[PDB]
Amino acid sequence: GRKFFVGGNWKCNGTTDQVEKIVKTLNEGQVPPSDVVEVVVSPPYVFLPVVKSQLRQEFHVAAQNCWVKKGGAFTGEVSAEMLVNLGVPWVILGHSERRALLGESNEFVGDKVAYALSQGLKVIACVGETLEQREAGSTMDVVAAQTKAIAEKIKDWSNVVVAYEPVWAIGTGKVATPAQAQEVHASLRDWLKTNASPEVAESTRIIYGGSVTAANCKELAAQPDVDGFLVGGASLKPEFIDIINAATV
Amino acid sequence: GSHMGRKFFVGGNWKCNGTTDQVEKIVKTLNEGQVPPSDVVEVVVSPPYVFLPVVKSQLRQEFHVAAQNCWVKKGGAFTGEVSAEMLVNLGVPWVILGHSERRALLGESNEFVGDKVAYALSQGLKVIACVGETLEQREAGSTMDVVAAQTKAIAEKIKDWSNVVVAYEPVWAIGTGKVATPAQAQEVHASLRDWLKTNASPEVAESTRIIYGGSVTAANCKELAAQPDVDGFLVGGASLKPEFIDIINAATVK
């Protein structure tokens, strides 16, 4: 039904030599065919050209962010139409690090997703609640509000992937387990069924954006409402190849 | 009067503009341009992040590239951001920090910008540090209160100003319908240099380039260059155009 999706978010990491090595490893990696798994890798802006030119054609690149509207007098920002012009097909929007550290609001993220889609980008849209929010019993309230801010602004989900980030397991004493992931993914999919449409809920990939390793990827992949991963640290490692192969689960 | 003269400095801020073929054309025009030698003028061009590779690879030797921003500290778990050490590794020697658009639209605080400048320098980047007041601030009589606060936030975090260029942006004359005269630019630049004299040192005041980041065209660049405390420009829109070459040549006014 839904094609397994694996995204690698490099975050703010990379040197010319390290990028050379990562691309070599990606290109030499033994992975399932493209009808089994969809693979997207996301370098920092400055490495998008060299990665896009060297990367195997089954794998596509994503920017880690883009501006909320048309380009122009926005020093330091990269516009959606700029990325599209460059041939970059994907963008990550609303990552928890940008919501938390760069103050990106629900509404701001929703507007970014809508604008990115309008220019022809495909979007990985991130949602997720904090430990405080989870312990207050507000997990679905918060995730619903984040997702609604996006849903209100778009009317085509065909090029959207939703990533759930268990922010409550970042820097805390808590581990997000596959059972816990599945519970949120199922709840999110039900939210989509009720608030977008049953068709959108059925066809939209919901990927897990918690810690993903070779050690836990297969058990995560086996959860019925987990459609793949947004990988953090392991995306910089040969381990990423093993994670992609969890698609066959 | 001990210090060697300040080398004229012309930076081009492309802002959030650029396509593959346009960027190719811009760089070819720069490469074909007749300009003074590098002992007379220092030229820096600042493309969006995604065009830093191709611009660096094609741009004439005498000219150097700048990023339009970088992150406040060491890299890591900061999705969407680009670290100073990453830029150094890529071979990008300059960065623009504290641009008025980032202060206003991305909410970059005085201290945030000051931390960015200190960290960029610590990694070996050269910095174009931007300051300037809004129309409201200017009409409130707060021009130097605001610019002092912005500049203090940088000054309190660094010792060595050698690789800093300060850009004064008359935000009050950017998009408001007001214009700034070269006389008004000179007034602020002189006041800012006097602030540096007292709050850093007279040597820092004498050696530090203070460049004008208001509207610069081929038509007004020579009169701006003629101002004694204007050491060059941070050019906006004209930096995408052949006109940028004419602006670089205003260095000979000195």
From Swiss-Prot, chain A:
Its main location: cytoplasm. Its EC number is 5.3.1.1. Signal peptide: none annotated. Keywords: Cytoplasm, Gluconeogenesis, Glycolysis, Isomerase. The keyword Endoplasmic reticulum does not apply. Disulfide bonds: none annotated. Pfam families: TIM. HAMAP family: TIM_B. GO terms for molecular function: triose-phosphate isomerase activity. It catalyses: D-glyceraldehyde 3-phosphate = dihydroxyacetone phosphate. The active site is at 95 (electrophile), 165 (proton acceptor). The keyword Cytoplasm applies. Substrate binds at residues 9, 11. One of its GO terms (biological process) is gluconeogenesis. This is Triosephosphate isomerase, cytosolic. Belongs to the triosephosphate isomerase family. It is an enzyme of class 5 (isomerase). It comes from Zea mays. GO terms for cellular component: cytosol. InterPro entries: Aldolase_TIM, TIM_sf, TrioseP_Isoase_bac/euk, Triosephosphate_isomerase, Triosephosphate_isomerase_AS. Pathway: Carbohydrate biosynthesis; gluconeogenesis; Carbohydrate degradation; glycolysis; D-glyceraldehyde 3-phosphate from glycerone phosphate: step 1/1. It is found in: Cytoplasm. Homodimer. It comes from the Eukaryota. In plants, there are two types of TPIS, cytosolic and plastid.
